[PDB]
Design a protein around this ligand. Structure first.
Ligand SMILES: COc1ccc2c3ccnc(C(F)(F)F)c3n(CCCCN)c2c1
Length: 345
């Protein structure tokens, strides 16, 4: 029993062969990525004389149609003149090859999860965290340009890659989960650890959910550890509450899924549901201590390092708390984030 003549496995993926030449142009080197989606390969373009990453989509209607969304959004980004688009991975061209849609991207280096692995999850400096933070704020500003209004819907360290392994330049990848501002379709979105409270509560959402994710990410880059590591949605909300307290009454009064995590007392105020004592009381796990503002950084491991002063840590703390505002209408936006004192030289 064969699939697609030679060419596919029993699972609609193209069977990758090292050394194969496509369309008398692309020399396939190796398999570098897997997903649901299909595969990613490192390949040499003989014509243009450069390495590329090729995203080979499964030969199956559902994934093809998903990738065409990705293509459409990238091509939309492509027609904008500004320099801010460089923080998004660039789609060079696409083509069908043996019944698989193939997206050709510029070749990048490792992602920010791999970078943490090399620190043994002890985190990178605050100077480097800042460089990443500034570039991401700029990328979100670009996505926010009115004619795009794109929500990535899945920011996490895995989906932010270095351009070069010895430099700090980064880009966002994978717009297959994305959408534009408009009428709600999707409700179960964002990777759990990076999932915003408006999504957890079943409420309306907008581009601000990406800023929440960024907040969680930047802390995790410096500590090496995820800020909110929930095993399920209840645990995820409880871990959020440990740091940031009970969310405001006016929000919870409108949440469809309010009662999944909370109960409204006879006097109108909201509490956690009682579900073996486990969590720290509401708002007692202060971000102040997580970052180690006055105690030499996370685990005290930055004591005596330059570029880790108390003054520097306070600016970081402030910016992060603005990204982790419970209210998506007052949560800081990209244009104003870029003006914060954490970026003044
Ligand atoms: C090595 O350089 C690149 C360059 C671009 C991409 C890219 C673009 C879109 N989607 C993905 C993927 F993550 F596989 F979904 C991409 N990936 C895969 C991410 C690597 C981990 N699976 C890319 C990798």
């Amino acid at each position: 029993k064969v699939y697609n003549d030679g060419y596919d496995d029993d699972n609609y993926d193209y069977i990758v062969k090292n050394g194969e030449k496509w369309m008398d142009r692309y020399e396939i080197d190796s398999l570098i990525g897997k997903g649901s989606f299909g595969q990613v390969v490192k390949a040499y373009d003989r014509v243009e004389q450069e390495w590329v990453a090729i995203k080979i989509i499964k030969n199956k209607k559902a994934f093809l149609n998903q990738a065409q969304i990705e293509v459409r959004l990238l091509e939309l980004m492509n027609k904008h003149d500004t320099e801010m688009k460089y923080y998004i991975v660039h789609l060079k061209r696409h083509f069908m090859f043996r019944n698989h849609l193939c997206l050709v991207f510029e070749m990048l280096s490792y992602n920010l999860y791999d970078l943490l692995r090399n620190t043994n999850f002890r985190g990178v400096s605050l100077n480097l965290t800042r460089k990443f933070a500034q570039q991401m704020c700029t990328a979100l500003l670009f996505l926010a340009t009115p004619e795009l209004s794109i929500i990535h819907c899945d920011l996490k360290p895995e989906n932010i890659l270095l351009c070069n392994p010895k430099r700090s330049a980064i880009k966002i990848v994978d717009f297959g989960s994305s959408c534009q501002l408009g009428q709600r379709i999707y409700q179960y979105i964002q990777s759990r650890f990076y999932r915003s409270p408006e999504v957890l509560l079943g409420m309306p959402y907008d581009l601000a959910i990406d800023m929440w994710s960024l907040g969680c990410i930047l802390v995790e880059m410096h500590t090496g550890e995820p800020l909110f590591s929930g095993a399920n949605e209840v645990d995820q909300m409880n871990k959020i509450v440990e740091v940031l307290g009970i969310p405001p009454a006016h929000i919870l009064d409108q949440a469809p899924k309010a009662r999944k995590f909370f109960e409204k007392l006879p006097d109108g105020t909201w509490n956690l549901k009682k579900t073996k004592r486990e969590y720290k009381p509401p708002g007692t796990r202060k971000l102040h201590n997580i970052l180690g503002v006055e105690t030499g950084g996370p685990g005290g491991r930055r004591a005596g390092e330059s570029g880790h002063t108390v003054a520097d840590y306070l600016k970081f703390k402030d910016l992060i708390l603005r990204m982790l505002d419970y209210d998506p209408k007052t949560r800081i936006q990209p244009y104003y984030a870029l003006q914060h004192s954490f970026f003044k030289k």
